[model samples]
Structure formats: C-alpha cells, structure tokens
Target: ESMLTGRVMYNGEALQLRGNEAVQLQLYQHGYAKHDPINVYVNQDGMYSANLFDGEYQMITKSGNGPWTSEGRDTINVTVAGNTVQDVEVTPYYLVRDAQMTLEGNKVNASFKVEKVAGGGIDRVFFMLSTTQFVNDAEHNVDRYDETDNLDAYDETGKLYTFATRDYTDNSMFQTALKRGTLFGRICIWPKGSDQGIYSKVIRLK
Candidate 1:
C-alpha cells in the first residue's frame, strides 16, 4: 500500500500560502494603504480566504490580500482617530454616459422619445434644438443615460409645452423640418477625463 499525496488548488490553479507577496503588490495598485495586515486562510475544501481592515482602498485584490477576481465595485469606511465627522464611505466613483431629448407642439400635444444606449447614466444631461439645416452645436453635461440629448432643451419641469402631440397635425412640424432641410445633432458623453470612462454615440433628431 502507498500513501496518496497531491497539491490542492485555490481558485482554479494550485496556489500556495507562500505566494502572498505577489497578491499584496497587486492590491497596492488599486490604492490600498500599505503597512496593514492581511489575513489569509485555507479550508479543508481547498478554499482560500483573505481578511481586510476597514479603510479606503482600491485593489486588484478581491479581499484582504488574497488571490481573487473583483468586479471593481466595493466600498470602504474610514475613521480618523476618535473623529466621527471625518469618517466616510470609500466608494469607487465613475463617470457615466447619458442622453435625452424632447419634441413639442403648439397645442395638439407632443410626444418625443429620446433613445439611449444600453446602460451608462451620468450625473447630468444637456440638449438643444434648431430649425437651421445645419448647426454647430454646444456641449453640456448630463447625469443619466439616454441616446438623445434633448433634456437640456426642456425646463426644470420637463414641459416644453410650446409643442404638443395631442393631434396628428403636430407631426407636420417634424416633417417640415425635414423637407425644408434640417441639421441633425449629436450628444457627446464624457468623463471629466480623470479615470477610465466612456462617452455615448451621436444620434440625429429631425
């Protein structure tokens, strides 16, 4: 008879407790503070664990200096000595893309659908409209996601009562703009350009 001996795998690959240094370095890239202790453990089932302290940190690490993949969304709480006011949630902030728009009528009633991309809502949105066949546009910021940038065209109440879609005749306004010649516009979504972020596509609204 012979005794069986084999190495166990943590997360898909055979990992050892001694390779903790590489894990720690990866965490540092995410903005985690140094000099803190990371607790690691392995269970009988071959599962590994890492424990972290409460603090603001960005880490490629999944948890407490352990080898795990992260979805890049987590929060941390920080406390400075006995001061409670300084303590705050250390959450990752991101710049998102968004768009919106509106169509209006004089009295009939207006219905406007501002299409949007899949998912990326920002903090604010801006929109504009014009009768010129082609118009140079201005830039504005939005806080939500949409394919249309028409939100800026509306007032605080989102009521551009000047146009209504109550009657079928209101369609003529949009049609006339097309026949007489119109210039489509685009919505530009952007981050303040401090981190990894995305912008939206420009769509034409006649």
Candidate 2:
C-alpha cells in the first residue's frame, strides 16, 4: 500500500489556500486505458494526503484555480512505493501583507501593505467587508473601496482604506453584516485588466 502526502510552499512559507485560491495535485499513471488521472485538493494548510497504489506516477501541480496564479510551476515523475512525500513550490507575483482593519465613528478603516513576490506592478486594491470570515471578491460582500487611480508604485507604501462616505454603516449593501455586529473585512490586490487578484485573509473589524 502506498500513501502520498505533500505540502505546497512559496519561498519557505506555506501557501495557505485563501478565498477561492486552490491547489490541486494531479497523479497520472500509465500502462492501461483505465489509468485516469487522480486529482486531489490541497487544504488551507497547504497539505494533501492520498491513499495510492505502488506505481510509477507523474504528478502535476495546478496552483491558481481561483483568483491568484503561481505563474506555471509543476512537479513530475515520481515513484510511490510507501509513504511518499512530494512537496511543491510556487512563487506568487504579489501578496497582500499585514492586513488590518478598524472601526471609525461611522465607517470601517482598512490598511495593508503589498509585497511583490516575483516582479510586477499592481493595478488596483480592493477593501471589502462581509459577515463571513472568509471575505473575498465574489461572495458575502459589503461595499468596497477601490484604489484605482494611483498604482504607479502602489506597493511602495501602505494603503489606508476608507469607504465612500454615504452613511456606510447604514449602507444598503452593508446593512446585513453591520446590523448583525459581525463585520469581517479583507484586502484584495487585483491585476490590471484581469479577473484575478491576491486576496488577503479575512480580518474582523467588529
């Protein structure tokens, strides 16, 4: 019997799955027509375990299933006989670092720093609020603050996000979470003209 376990990391830090970010391991075995590839999902802690058979297999890593991408990295050709460990490494183009939030008199203030992991310019930053702990771009969203005009060197300084001033606490989109007193917030660094971004981990604002 063979069991395969692995971790996904980026530059010595485990690439924890956040928002809709996903990491998948595709195990391809050859020899017969029934040798379909086995796909496994890596969890939030960047870990995966699979009960497998003893065989020579090719493993491919697909890291950016949702908003972020690893820029094409993979592992291939492994022989699994017992407890196998196949760790994969990924490098991100950008990461939202040091995300924080606070409550003002009538609004939420969000702040964060962005670190460019590989080397690219960011287009916009989004500060979003939600009731769910996993706040992101596509779900459970309140109103958002977008930094769109000045991104020439946006990553060089920290961003302090304050929402558009229109009675935000009673905002139609934010009323549900604000009334429930369970406001969660996060930051998103989006690519220019793309449907992808680097989503910060959810932070509680209230």
Candidate 3:
C-alpha cells in the first residue's frame, strides 16, 4: 500500500478553513483508460491524504464550491511506492481581492477589484447584482450550471450589466435587490480578447 498526502494553496497562501471552496483531486492510473478515477477531497486545513495500492498515477485537481475558476493547466505525476507528499499551487484566472456593497439613497453602490493571476492584464470587468446567490450546481443542477440566470438576471432587468476595457478599480450604482429577494453580487473580470473569465465570491447585500 502507498500513502499520498498534499496541500492546496491559493495565491501562494493556504486557504481559509471557513467560507472557502472545497479542493478535489482526480486520480488517473498511468496505463488504464477506462478505470474509474478515484476522487480525493481536501480537509479544512488544505491538506489531503489517501492510501492506494502501489501504482503510477496522474493527478489533476481544482477547487470546488466557489465562484472563482482556475486557469491552471498543470498536472502532477505520482509514483506511489511509499508515503509521498505533494503540494499544488493554483492561481485563479481572475482573482477578486475585495468586494463590498453599500446602500446609498435608493440604489446600491458596488465596488470591487480583481487581480489577473494568469497575466497579460485584464480587458474587461463588470459588476453583477443578483437577487439570489450563486450555488455550486455543476453536479446536479445541470440546466443552470454557470448560468447568469441563477442571479435573477431577468427579474430586475438592469441587475445584469457589464463594462468593457476597464481598469482594475471600478464602481457602479444600481437598483436595490431589496424587493427582488436576497441580494448577491459578484465582480467578473476577463482577459484580453477572450470570453473566458472568473468571478468573485457571492457577496451579500445588507
């Protein structure tokens, strides 16, 4: 038997135990194309361990239960003969550093900033105010997975908006989500000339 252990770090830092995403590890045997891949999950402390029969495996991992998407394309080769340890470092395509909302007059004020972890700078940024929060439905809710409609895009109409070719720091004022329901907003940023992007965590509007 062989034991495998490792940690997943984001932005060069360990992930927080609370209010964070779940890390998933996918194991692929070296010479098997149809074997059921073993899935390993990380503990709250960003550490994961697993025991398996000695074999060569390719490991691919990503974060779950969060809005941010990783642009990481690297994999690790694990030759499990004895106890082996590995660390996976990841950077989101667009890292949202801070996001907050304030009530000003009758409208809600939104402000946020995102760091381009994959480099080449950001080409577009936008703030979205959703009446409902974003839920991780990739496994079950196939119809609504990654759908902006989950945010009640058509409920309030203007709740869905965007900005093109914007700088790192940006702000906007929009209609309150009070009557629509629970207020959830996220900041989205995209790299130049691409529709692929990443979003901030779901922010609750007080």
Q: State which candidate has the highest TM-score.
A: 2
Q: Candidate 2 or 3, higher lDDT?
A: 2
Candidate 3 ranges with C-alpha deviation above 4 Å = 1-9, 12-26, 31-56, 61-73, 77-87, 135-181, 193-195
lDDT (tens digit, per residue) of candidate 2 on 11-117: 77665354333446677786334557788777655678888988888776644453345465655677898889887676666667787777775666677776766
1-206 per-residue lDDT for model 1 (tens digits): 11112222322433222221222322232345553533333322223333334434332323433222233425333322221222111122221123333334421221322222222333333223334422212321211123334434432222321221222244554456546654233332221221222222233444
TM-score of every model? 0.22, 0.70, 0.47
Mind giving the per-residue lDDT tens digits that candidate 3 earns over 1-206?
78898876676655322122344667888533565678777654457788888878877663343223455645678888889887766554445456565544445555554444445445555565545554222211101112232222222212333332222122222232454445555555444443344455666754
Cα lDDT, model 3, residue 58: 79
Model 2 RMSD vs true structure: 4.4
Against the correct fold, how does model 3 do in TM-score? Answer: 0.47
Better of 1 and 2 by TM-score: 2
- lDDT score of residue 111 within candidate 2: 70
**Alpha carbon lDDT of each predicted model:** 0.29, 0.66, 0.51
* Model 3 C-alpha lDDT versus the unseen true structure: 0.51
